[PDB]
């Protein structure tokens, strides 16, 4: 009998799991499907982001990145047989699958290592309020190979990648399959408009095979809803001047795989292409799926499951964190909606997560480090809101060739006092930048005390401290006033 | 007549310059030595830091940079003939020469399309507590080509390289020489201990001839004299770990020049070596020099005029700003000297330029940010201190080769109620991480508030939210309390 049976070794699940038994000594059950990195369900121990999400991903963008520096090197005199040059998937996959693999066995240790901490290989199945099945299967009809009984269950399942219902889309891919590709495509097409879509985009158009050509294609207007307006016209310039096609106001209709191994993907848009690869980055849903929760009563808002501010649900001895809870996405927030759970319930003070001026990146190329509020929504709040806006290409980038390359930095402000409500910037360091400036924001910063910094020169962060006249504002309605 | 001359078409002068007759509607003159970068002065229009300063040389650590990537991008896949991989100095240097020359170009139009300001090309003396000669050299005995009558004068002669007093001093050569080398050298010894001598350290290295040889050598015990701790012996591991010798308690006694061209430097410390070039970076002092400042009865506290919190000499229509008053030698705390001088005297408010918790960098390689106290200052200052220290090797530097290339991050903190006192990282992105953590501690940031912002994941900068718990203590002395 257990005082924790947390279902999903994840980041936001490990963290809570080993919070409980090393900090308050409690006796916990971690069940998770694997336990290393891959097929056939692709997480394992260590949740998401370690095996097939952000780990991986930035070891991948990283190397794609590298073919920016092979590049603008050669303008501050770096030469060398650049026929002889090219990129080797092979190689990169290799090394990433060691990386991963690793986290995973380090894991392993942790329970091998820790009193209260055990972990049962499995999937886990409510069966009442509280006992939870380890079940062999998705399937609740699979054999059970163990009941856990318990004091509390944490819900942290996370979420699965979301797929169309299209003619063909079984001949389409995913995050997690993209990961462990043998070779990189030629043709490929990346569904959907935003993060995944656009850091895959990235990924593929690096070691794509010289002939090779990546279409992004977004049923929107512009990529990255949801994003600062500046940001995302010019990513999607940028994007399409390394030379990535960015098909906007066109959908996947029907994939129908022709003959060769090749794939027709014919748009509701009309349009008929042709891909090697089609992978569907249209979104990302709770887990909540076979975790059996009627049997236990608890209650789904829509989609995932519903969680208060302390992050439990109607039933009482049972919480949820995460991307179960459909919340914010983002694994540093799953860890500390993790942290704040046992600090409230196997703790003294109670403890609840802000999951207001979370800074997060884009990790394209070039990247995105954004905090705080979009123009669009802080001028629904505030009456006088100020927009203040920097673009410029660097001069490095003047002397590298990559002249298409701007910089924005750009600094909304609640013209009304001064408080800085949104930072938003596009360019090379963009997510390091944008991590110190979160802190700025959860310390109330004034738009005054950002000017008035001295600036760290030259580097393109002392930007954000050269802004003082605003560009303009809205009045409700945008007025350059 | 004008109301102000300025000596100096500095950072600080040209600031000053600029924000009086533009913002003042004041009639400015402003003199310097030469109109643009290069022997003999190697000073002109915009300063030291725009023509054998900052600009230049973070220009030319970009380009030494692309070593790192062009080898730790092999493990990411990319492939190249490495043989066939070659760097060409000729090329970097030239590219230089042509930014830097623009912004010399700039400055021209600037001064040819504002009323006010007007450019004496030549060398600014002190006639009077208020007329100032352009004269024709150096030498106050050269021809006066100009007398400018004013009602203020604005000294911002800015600093030279410091020579030492040395049998053969004659063969070395400065910062200001190396901008402007024919080509690389193979045998380099920098003298000196921090910052320019080991940014340029960096720079020598990369461009070196493969049998090139680096040496920077130091008379103290640990180069950056005046770095936290850490970030000393780390920097000084990576740099010898990138093959760049550093010899301390090693110091010139006796360049001699020797037959080939060759020189023969003997230490004091005995020791005797053979080197292509010598650079002195010792120091720098305040261009103090030939202003002739008795004339108006000017007052050198040490090295530069001294000047209080407002900028203002015993001289009662005399000012002075940058690196002439030997406050903080950087150039945006010259630009805010500049621009609260003409706030202060052209305008209604005083102003003064906070000279505290100013957020800078070395572009090493891997680079320094750092701001605040270090933990020896400030342990003097306040009676219980926590230091909290975070090394890690990067996974993407696992992957990469570069094992050796470990981050830094150090939080010095006053334990009697958390406040920030100072933040020091060494490692890649460095520089634009520190720029936020600046404005954090002018909003008199506590560590509570550092660790308690979400992450950005994954980034290094991530890494200072991280830290909670302390690693040791001063309670006057250093204590794992
Ligand atoms: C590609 C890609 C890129 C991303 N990039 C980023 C990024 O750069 N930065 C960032 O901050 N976030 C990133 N994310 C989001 C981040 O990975 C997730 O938000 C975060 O890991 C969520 O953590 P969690 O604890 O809710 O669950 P998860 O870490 O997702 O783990 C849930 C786990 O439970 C197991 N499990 C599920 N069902 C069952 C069951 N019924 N029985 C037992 N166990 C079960 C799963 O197999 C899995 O291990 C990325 C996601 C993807 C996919
Ligand atoms: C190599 C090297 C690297 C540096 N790197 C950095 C860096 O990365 N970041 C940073 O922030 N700072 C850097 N600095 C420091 C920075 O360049 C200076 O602090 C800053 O430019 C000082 O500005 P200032 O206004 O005092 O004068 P300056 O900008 O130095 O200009 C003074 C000017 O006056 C002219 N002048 C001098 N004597 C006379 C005279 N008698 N008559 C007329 N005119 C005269 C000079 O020729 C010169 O143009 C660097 C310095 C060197 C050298």
């Known amino acids: 009998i257990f005082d924790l049976v947390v ?12 919070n409980a038994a090393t900090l308050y000594k409690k006796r916990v059950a971690v069940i998770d499907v694997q336990m290393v990195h891959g097929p056939p369900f692709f997480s394992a121990l260590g949740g998401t982001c370690v095996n097939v999400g952000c780990v991986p991903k930035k070891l991948m963008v990283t190397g794609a990145q590298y073919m920016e520096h092979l590049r603008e090197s050669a303008g501050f005199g770096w030469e060398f047989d650049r026929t002889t040059l090219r990129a080797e998937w092979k190689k990169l996959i290799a090394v990433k ?11 392993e240790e942790m329970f091998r290592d820790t009193e209260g901490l055990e972990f049962f290989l499995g999937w886990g199945s409510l069966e009442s309020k509280n006992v939870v099945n ?63 879509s656009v850091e895959f985009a990235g990924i593929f158009n690096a070691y794509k095979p010289k002939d090779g050509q990546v279409t992004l294609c977004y049923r929107g207007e512009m990529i990255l809803r949801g994003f600062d307006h ?28 022709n003959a060769d191994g090749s794939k027709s ?26 975790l059996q929760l009627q049997n236990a009563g608890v209650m789904i808002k829509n989609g995932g499951v519903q969680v208060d501010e302390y992050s439990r649900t109607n039933v009482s001895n049972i919480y949820a964190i995460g991307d179960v809870t459909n919340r914010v996405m983002l694994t540093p927030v799953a860890i500390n909606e993790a942290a704040a759970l046992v600090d409230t319930v196997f703790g003294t003070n109670p403890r609840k997560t802000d999951h207001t001026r979370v800074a997060s990146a884009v990790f394209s190329i070039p990247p995105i480090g954004t905090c705080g509020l979009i123009e669009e929504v802080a001028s629904k709040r505030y009456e006088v809101v100020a927009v203040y806006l920097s ?6 980038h003047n002397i590298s060739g990559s002249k298409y390359k701007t ?44 000017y008035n910094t001295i600036g760290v020169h030259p580097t393109s962060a002392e930007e954000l401290c050269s802004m003082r006249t605003p560009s303009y504002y809205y009045v409700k309605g945008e007025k350059m006033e």
């Not at 994840?10 to 809570?16: D, H, T, V, Y």
């Not at 699958?97 to 690793?102: G, M, Q, R, S, T």
Request: charged content about 20%; some cysteine.
């Open 134 to 196: 380890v079940r062999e299967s998705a399937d609740p009809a699979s054999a059970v190979k163990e009941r856990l009984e318990t004091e509390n269950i944490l819900l942290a399942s996370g979420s699965w990648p979301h797929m169309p219902n299209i003619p063909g889309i079984e001949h389409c891919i995913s995050s997690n399959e993209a990961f462990y590709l043998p070779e990189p495509p030629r043709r490929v097409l990346t569904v959907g408009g935003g993060f995944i």
């Open 230 to 257: 500046t940001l995302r016209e010019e990513l999607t310039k940028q994007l399409t001047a390394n030379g990535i096609q960015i098909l906007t106001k066109e959908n996947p209709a029907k994939v129908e795989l």
């Open 391 to 396: 673009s410029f290409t660097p001069l490095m």
């Open 7 to 18: 279902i999903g070794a994840g980041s936001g699940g490990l963290e809570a799991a080993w």
């Open 265 to 290: 993907v014919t748009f509701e848009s009309g349009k008929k292409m042709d891909f090697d690869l089609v992978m569907m980055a249209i979104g990302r849903s709770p887990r909540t799926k076979d």
């Open 407 to 450: 910089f924005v930095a750009k600094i909304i402000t609640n013209h009304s006092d001064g408080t800085v409500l949104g930072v938003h910037l596009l360019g090379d360091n963009a997510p390091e930048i944008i991590q110190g400036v979160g802190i700025c924001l959860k310390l109330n910063a004034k738009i005054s005390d950002f």
């Open 97 to 107: 699958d060691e990386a991963v693999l690793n986290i995973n066995k380090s894991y």
